[PDB]
Amino acid sequence: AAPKNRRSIEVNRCRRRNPQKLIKVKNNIDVCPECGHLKQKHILCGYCXXXXXXXXXXXXXXXXXXXX
Amino acid sequence: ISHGRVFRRLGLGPESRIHLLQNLLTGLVRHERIEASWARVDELRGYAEKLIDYGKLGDTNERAMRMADFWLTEKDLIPKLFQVLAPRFQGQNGGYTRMLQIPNRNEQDRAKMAVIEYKG
RNA sequence: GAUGUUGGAUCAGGACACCCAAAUGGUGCAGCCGCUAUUAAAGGUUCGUUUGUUCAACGAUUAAAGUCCUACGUGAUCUGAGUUCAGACCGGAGCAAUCCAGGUCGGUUUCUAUCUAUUAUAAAUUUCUCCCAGUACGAAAGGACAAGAGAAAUGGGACCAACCUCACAAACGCGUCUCAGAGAUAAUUAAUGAUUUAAUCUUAACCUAAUUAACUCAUAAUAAAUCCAGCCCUAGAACAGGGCACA
RNA sequence: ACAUAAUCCCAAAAAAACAAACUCCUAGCCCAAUACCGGACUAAUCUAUUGAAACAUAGAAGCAAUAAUGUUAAUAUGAGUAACAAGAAGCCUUUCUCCUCGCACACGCUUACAUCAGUAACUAAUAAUAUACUGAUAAUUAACAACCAAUAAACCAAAACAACACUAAAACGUUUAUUAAUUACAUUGUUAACCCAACACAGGAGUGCACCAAGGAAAGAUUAAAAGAAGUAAAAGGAACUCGGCAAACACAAACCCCGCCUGUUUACCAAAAACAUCACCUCUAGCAUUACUAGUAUUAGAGGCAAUGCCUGCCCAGUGACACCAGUUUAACGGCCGCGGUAUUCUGACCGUGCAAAGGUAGCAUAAUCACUUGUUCUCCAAAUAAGGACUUGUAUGAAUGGCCACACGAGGGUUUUACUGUCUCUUACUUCCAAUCAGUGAAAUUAACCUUCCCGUGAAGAGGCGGGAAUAAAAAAAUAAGACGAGAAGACCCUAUGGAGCUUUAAUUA
RNA sequence: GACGAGCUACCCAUGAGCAGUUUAAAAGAACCAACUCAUCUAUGUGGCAAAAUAGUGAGAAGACUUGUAGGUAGAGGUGAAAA
């Protein structure tokens, strides 16, 4: 099918703004119990964990290379 | 309909699903911890517990043996599973395969990331 | 500078000049069945064979297998059987180029929905069989109204305990269960005391006895907002709904 | 007595006022308009004059734009819609898992490629990155592939792992003699990456041999709605579906016709068929030479019709054509092949009479690829048969080389009947995958006068969301259904018009 | 007045290709891969694609397929003939 007529500005605004509610803002922000950095709720920190996971990955690769 | 149904799909066929589970479990038992999507992880939990229990059954027993040979093709995983990983969980019942959530998301699909790890 | 022309499938709605079911009148209406006419559209109005039918003939039922309108409803839902144009023959017409409101075969059917509109509360509906009975009536043949009981059918709203399709604890009918008062008026038609008009008259008045569907309910489903992060669900597109013994 | 929701415009009611470009009063620029005609002026450019960053006196025009499915450019609507994108774990580089079909020689294709460096931006519909981006810098040889002796003589008996044989009468081959040539230790190219279809496009092509130790991964993620596509399974019935066993799981047993012999060929891109071709039959024209026929010679060549084969191909030369010459001949040349009346229970007419014509359908066939009436009648098939098969013959409107009647075999041709088996159907149900749905990245399209966009009853160029009167309604999305906006898409392909066009055919007329 | 047979139609010259199975001598018959075609159905319908894909089907030693080098054009050519 094809549009009968061109859309007015008002209809476009009312359609693209109100019903979609834009982006609903909740609070995901929580302070890390360890380093005190701001991170997401119900989730592990992105500071004191990713570095320890990379150090654990390097230690696992070094142990796997030393065992072989 | 989805009424009363476990055993999800995740856009993969039955063979692809089983093989995916076998691969994720391979990586899990190999590295002792892995990172994957929340759905695949949550699905992998039960099967992991099942393989662990199968390891808890017996070493000499044929049922457990051929089951372990069926799911895991790799010859490196089985002895490390039975001799090492199994005896430490001997006292535990539901105490294995812990799931945690990863803070960030992928730059492409923004897929929710989660990690599965056995108790050390 | 296009409203796509038959039929079929699908999905219906409406009209009443009613086929059937309902209420009656008359009958050359004994009775049972018919005929004719009145009131009534709530529901229902089948499955096949031949041929493109619009038809028609025929088979088996059924309470009946009604008619018409809706662009002779419905191709931005489908079908191309018919027909509206590129070929191959018969027959007719024409010296010929070719035709025929004739008959045989074949012939790609394009679109992602912008607006309007739409995405259900319910109370039912139809039949057969049995019982009184083989009595009254009638030479014989023949032969109910009412009341009661048991079965289905269509259909409304459902469910998964068995059976069935079932490779998890799900969805289904082919399986199971249920289906209800009541009040009032229809148009007929049948009356009681009774005028105008000493009689008569269902009507003029008036107290009043009784009569299909619709039209309505004594009622059954409904509504405690104002936290709901996060984890789950037989719940689910999002949302909504439910359930998890927060810091 | 007609077909969506009522009343013949609301509600009601019962049984002298209101009210128009008309008239008057008040002011003045003094008394409408379509085609067409007339008068008087304004905006803009330039020139003469004047004035100098604003104007009027005239002359001179490429002189005033809202439309032509206008032109060009910019920017919207649709729309954040359609569309594009299924392995994993790790780790600095491996492992596990999935699906196979491709490496060399070219014709070509003109640095894509290799290394390094940089990726805001463009480039590969995004990221990762990069064999297919930018910038700079590397780009292997040869005994590989291209490029070379002039002539003159000798010789018959093809190739098919071929003494041989057959037919279609045979790709490339060798020898002898004479002359002559030099640095012929050279010149180009390969090995770069792949390319034709506007695209990094499920479509395309030549040659040798592997099918794997070569190679590609459905390389964004969720949701498990409707619905669609592909696929799997099913109680009982087993074509009850339908124009048709289409489709589809299982299988292919049997029956009967039309047409065409058959193996093929034909509207590339709606027709693959009965059409054309084909062996064969017949008619008819050619006794002749060196760039067709043919380096052929009546057993050859051209032309026409028919179409294996089997049985046959009867009559008519008045007209046309053709051959001998005005007369005749010639049907496997163009074609044509009758009517009426009378005669034995009924009916029918072997027979007879008659009109007409050049001569009036012989064999065989027949409600047929033909039959109008028609669904002819009868028989078979089926519980029912406008179809089908077998007969009858008043054959509207079969007919013997545009052949007639049959015919084994053959057919992706056109029809009919039993069996077998099936989700075709009664009658649908469930599952899998790709889409649809959500989120994120990139971000269309036709369409569109502007749109605050309800319904009913009427009216209006006779089918209203914009008109009237009633009814209904706070404001905006998403997933779905296709009734309306005479929806979108093609200046109707039917009809008719224009003293339009073009193709084809002739005794249309006119003629190199 | 010219450009066009690198598409396609026919032809000339020069090359190449067409497993396997049953079989009486048989490049002989029938079936069936490549290759050459496009029967039916479905999907696709601003597409993967301005002729497609999937299943299925025909030919497949012949009137076969194909490479390269050439020839025939609009007052026409070609055409196992469909305007």
Ligand SMILES: [Zn+2]
């Ligand atoms: Zn931290």
